[model samples]
Target chain A: HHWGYGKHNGPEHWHKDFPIAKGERQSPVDIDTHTAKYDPSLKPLSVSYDQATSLRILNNGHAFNVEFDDSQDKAVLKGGPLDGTYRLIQFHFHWGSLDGQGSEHTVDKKKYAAELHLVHWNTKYGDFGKAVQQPDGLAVLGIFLKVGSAKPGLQKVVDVLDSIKTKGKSADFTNFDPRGLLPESLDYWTYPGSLTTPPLLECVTWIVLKEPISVSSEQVLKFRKLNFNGEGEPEELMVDNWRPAQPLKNRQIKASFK
Target chain B: HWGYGKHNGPEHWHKDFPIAKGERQSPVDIDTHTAKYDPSLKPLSVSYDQATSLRILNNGHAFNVEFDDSQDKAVLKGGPLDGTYRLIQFHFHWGSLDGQGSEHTVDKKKYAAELHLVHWNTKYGDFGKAVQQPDGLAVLGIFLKVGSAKPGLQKVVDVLDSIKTKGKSADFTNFDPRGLLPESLDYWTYPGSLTTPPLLECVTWIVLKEPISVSSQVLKFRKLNFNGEELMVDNWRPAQPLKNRQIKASF
Candidate 1:
């Protein structure tokens, strides 16, 4: 009855309920660097995050997300592929069961250890629901994560993972700026895509960063400890929740930098 | 360039062929417990003429017995198909070891080898044109388990010495591939693509649930050479993700 990344109601079965699963614009495309053309019209991405806007973090069965108070334009993202000012709603990570392959988006068919998605909603659309329905409604910033030296910025988020180990679990996560997760280079590949999960609406303008952030091998394993089910439910570790890359189909990916 | 090696394997194919990562790619692991049983699906009917069998060749990937399909000498219908599909060629996929050679696995369990009876929809005009359409190809897959020697396959194996290396071939007429099939035709059907380079998403895979038995001689495929330097072992592409495609069983 529910959609999951399992053998039963996996990505293959989503089309039965959500017809848009077979739509033109789909997410997590294999970003072929050779095919991506550099666009001079693209502006450098800019984002200003207020530490105070950082709210609670919760496990939502699919992924554990760190929510932000989008009531104000405090943590806003503009420029790059954005047409107007957008507020940051939440941020989550997509990973695999093991290293070497887990990221939703790939660079030249190369999979990263994990992928971080920063969700934002355009001001034109009144709310998340309304924005999700429009083409130019959302702008998602994708940051790739590879196993390397332990990052202090990411450690803060990993520290609170145990508190929300089970699905539907939440804990207070304040004054933690997600800006630390961003790599030094803002260079990105911009293209039209959809929500990687179900209801797969084609409303997102994906801006995937060329540079990848680093996380330690130990930290990556901690993420797998989180369960997909709630308390007293069947034990199902939340791993490989990412959707595989879909066909690019007539869609052109533009690069922010040459 | 499309050899099944560590460098040029299925994982590396997506770079050259984008559709390698596309939905409906083939050789998916047949999760038996999760597969849905459909009552609407009819029993498969295959009528192949021995005279239609042409030559056998080693295409450097897998050695297959080709058929003369100038007209419908052999045709497959009924099960999960709309129209009559003419037999084009039949090939195989196998692993280096006996424990794992099959392309399509059952509940993550691999067989010693797998046979593919390639057929194309006659409505598409020609095999070349049929390969271009989504519903053009209908491949009948029969898993080869390690067991007693199959008398039906001995005739085909007898000709392997003539075509030991890649690109080598010999005349192989009066061969009825139907003799190689199992008694039960109950199978799992799904939309899938060819499990090789130029991996076209055109095949409607009908994998038989009841595996056909084969002797240890199936390992003779390993002796075949890709060229003067290498042996053609483990040419089968790994199972691809079954994305947005359902696997229906007719039992």
Candidate 2:
């Protein structure tokens, strides 16, 4: 009855319930660098966050997310793919069970170890609920994660994973600076896309960074240990929660840098 | 490196390997209703030699049990083939889980896994030269469903740990592949090509109508790695379009 990344209910079956799964402007597209157009009009991205705004880490079965206090614009993402100030609400990751093919979005048809999505809503819209319905309401910052050196910023999140190993589990996690997870460069590719997961609405402006952040292979193994099932039911490894790249269709991907 | 990963998977194969989109491709969906019952086709014959088994290797793609094909000790004859084919190797294609895996489906129905017995035409001498011609290879495709434990398969599974990574191998002699076959020889035949890259259109495929059974032990195949980094899973290519091809059944 639910959509999952499996042979039976995987991405291929999502179109049955959500017709927009096959829509023209779907997300997680293959960022073919050869075809990306360099746009001079595009500006560098500006991001500011309040470490105190970090709230709880929750296992939502599909993914483990770090929520933030979005009552006000304490944490905001602007510039580069955004028209107005977008408030950071939450962030989650899409990864594979293994190291080589986890990231959802691919660059020149190559995948990274994992992908992090920082979800933000346009302040013009009342809230996330209302913002999700608008075409230009959500702006997501995507950062690819490679398997190499251990990222100290990610270790803090990995430490809390044991407490939230099962579905619906959560813990109070605060004062963690997400800026530490970003790479040195902010060069990006921007496009109009949708949510990779279902009710997959085409409401996001995707800003995918060129440089990838690093996470040790050991740290990634902790992520695969999380369970999709709750305490009682047969435990299933929560892995391969990434949607495959969709067709680019008529939309053009504009690069911020040459 | 070419693999089953999203970047270099079947969808992107044609970029480096153009022949993948060739007119004749293997592992097509055998639409039972549309298939023609060819009265001219004959039953297939298999002759095996237990001592012909040589070694098994994790070829960064699938684990293949090679045979001593220097002579006709083990061979495949009859069916849609005109002459004898010397057994070269045998391998499998499976999914991460039990629900879906088989390469060739019957009426759009997939099995848990698939086993392929590869052979080359003796007329062309060896596999190297035979693969270049259109009528050089014969492969027997057998579907595997999840059921009782297959004693024949357990031998392969037992030695998997030693060859868990890519480019690893172990001596695996004195095993017979005939034990892996189903009781029925009735099948659907077609002219196709290799399922993997450098996918030369040089095969006459004979897929069995009945399926063999295996236990959950088959899941261990996923424990193997594509390299030192990624675990091998979903190694089967999705069914290709059966363009301008006719499938003839011997049922």
Candidate 3:
């Protein structure tokens, strides 16, 4: 990547190039739970992702992306703050290089071991591209990862990380139920934001669950061992792959749980 | 989009659109160390006719100026390309007040805003099919710095007041999208995706190194409407992971 989590190429230096670093509305912001407003308009999220939707898994240097076949429209995410429906496209993770500060978004300025993002785009706009460009085009579900007990559900994903440790490496991974990764309650903090990465398009409906998922220390550490640069290139270790918390500007945070 | 406001903004997109954290994401931090100069880079070839202009629309997303891509009336070639990429549309992403817009950062700094010249690989049959392939789309991203007014952008801005509100649109013609681009074609090329969602990683991103100047007042036009009666104060996404993707510089 042109930008990385290195001393010379880390987040602190991101603004020098992508000036939007000081944007009024940016992502990876801290969530002050006590201060969030309670909104009655939000409904219980309806998520029914099938195990068969999982297609392949690849380590794109930044993180491991488990791509889903969104064509079936069966593995759907609805309710919550979403109108119509958003089709599951893919899901990936972000973590620290070796420490516990990998997660991008924070709760009351608290960091987690890692974070999981389940990306979906609105069906209202025909395709994911169109959906992601509109106000209600995308709906992302975020689950914070803590270095706690080994989650049985995560074993399905962890088992594959070994074979795809290098960047641009992929394996056929199917029958992987994404629903297994979710927390019990759909209760969440809803807000407006963009894909935390570049292009940073502002078109996401964020639903961050209050509860977090668990991953053992070993599982969390495995990601750090992944390489940032690929073979034949100047190999670099991929770690601390997380963007720092951004500012919560003129936006309001609505909570499902009062 | 997760809009600019007190409740909904940039801090909350990752929950659902997890691809926001993808490694090969676009609008990255540029450093010469990570980039290698490509002597084999070809000069850009742009051919557009003002008559090919169709109309402009504010889908509440951005002010998109559509072109007649139904035919090869306008095309962008060369500079890290294999074939012709037809110009389909062009738009901009900027900040609400100031100091917070433009997706691609250079040397760790940002321009006032970003302009994207989106094109589709015609070999893919249709635009839909192209966006799904590895080489489906090519985007020319131009940085917009606030300074002297760009006369080239004047025509584009002149028609903005007509498409100010959400869902507003008007017939736009006799204006070439080329008029809004920078003179120098030197750029940083990489493999990325549509900046928005499903955030497909199919675009061959070609971001120009030099940004053109635009009147700061042109930014005011970007702060139009955000459906349900909100103002579009900000409409830029955060920088994604560069992952393994390296920047190929055409110096």
Candidate 4:
């Protein structure tokens, strides 16, 4: 009855409940570089985060998310597709089981090992609950996760896989700097889009970083080991949670840098 | 580089397989206007070798029960064909769950799954060369939709678990490809291309209008792997544009 990333209630059937799943400006669109417009006027992205703002990492069956304390905009993103300050709320990932194509967005038809979405809601909209429902309310900073050697920056996050492998499980994981999770370059593609998952509200301005952050094959394997069900139910591998990129209908994708 | 998933899937195949966006591409939509009555088209005819050599291959795409087309064993003639066709292989394209999957949709409706029986013409000497030329190959498409259970399909479904992963093959024989066909021979014909890579634009397609009752097997079909880990879903490509290609029918 509830939405899930499964054969029964996957993205294909999401339109049955959330019709916006088929709406224009839906998220995770394939960034066709050929069609992307370069805008030099776009300013550099300014990100500020407080180490103490990190709260907990939870397994929500659909995805593993790291929630944060956004009470006073300790972690805020401004510029680079954002008109005003946006407070960091939570971040999550999407990945494939075996295709190594778990990322929601594809660059030139090339999919990365995984994708990380640092979700932030507009400060003008008051709170995330209200921000998520309005257009230009959310600004998602998308970072591609490529398969490579183990990253020390990500080791802390990977270490908790065993503890949070089950659904509804969480652990106090604070003081971790999310800046370490980002790629060196902030060069990005900007577009107006929606949430990749349902209710799939069209609200965000997407800032997809051009550069990718490295992750290990084993690190990604740990993500799939997590169960979709809680402790008691039959365990199913939580993978292929990414929604296929929707068509880029009549929208200009502005590049932050040439 | 040809895979069934997001990275190196059909969408990216166009860079390598130039014909991926060609005019004569396949698994097209066949509606009333798309299909025309060809009075000259002859009745569908087929001949197979005695106890045809069968090899079931899980090539990550589908469980292709390939026939020993090297010899002129199982051959197809007539039905808008100018020459005889040598049956090469028989495979399927299906969806993960029930609902839609068939390649050649009928009148804007898609069936549960599609069955393709590939054949190369005798004049080309070999399939490799034949695929490159126009009118060099012919593929017969049969639709497997929801209805009464297909008894003939159970045998094929029984061996599915054996070829669960890609690169798996087995000695499959005795099952006549024709046994999987429908009672009526009425079909729609058109020139198309190989649905997969290379996508050779030279196939004279013969698609049977009647579909046999087949369902539930898709659940088993979804269990199959494109690799050791991932299950192959959406193996069927979307129907391409018909363009000016004439779809001839045999009533």
Best by lDDT: 2
lDDT score for residue B44 of model 4: 87
Candidate 3: tens digits of C-alpha lDDT, residues A1-258: 266677887878887778866776678789998889888878888888764378788777677798888886788888988778788999998888655588889999899888899999888788887886786788889999987888888888988877776655567798898878987777899899777876667788888988998888887767777787643346687777888888888998889888
Candidate 3's displacement at residue A61, Å, is 2.0
Per candidate, the number of residue pairs that clash is 2, 1, 50, 2
DockQ (CA atoms), all models: 0.01, 0.01, 0.02, 0.01
Interface RMSD of each: 28.2, 22.5, 19.1, 22.0
DockQ of 4: 0.01
- Report the lDDT of model 2 for residue A120: 95
Task: Please state the i-RMS of candidate 4.
Answer: 22.0
Better of 3 and 4 by lDDT: 4
Clash pairs for candidate 2: A96-A102
User: TM-score of each model's B chain?
Assistant: 0.97, 0.98, 0.92, 0.94
Candidate 4 lDDT, A1-258, residue by residue in tens = 278888889878888989778788988898989888789888899888754388778887889899888889689998776789999888888889874588999998888878999999999978888888889899999999988878777888889988887665667788888987888898999999988987788898999999999888888888888888755346688889899888888888888766
Worst 10 residues of 3 chain B by lDDT: B1-10
Q: Residue by residue across B1-251, what tens digits does model 4's lDDT show?
A: 68767887777888888778888999799987657788888898877644264557687778887666656668998777888898877889988666788888888898889999888889988887787798899999999887776887877888888778765555577776666778888999888988888788998888998888875766788788898378877898888898878888887
Candidate 3 segments exceeding 4 Å error? B1-251
CAPRI classification of candidate 4: incorrect
Position B19, candidate 3: lDDT: 71
TM-score of each: 0.51, 0.51, 0.51, 0.51
| CAPRI tier for the interface of model 3 | incorrect
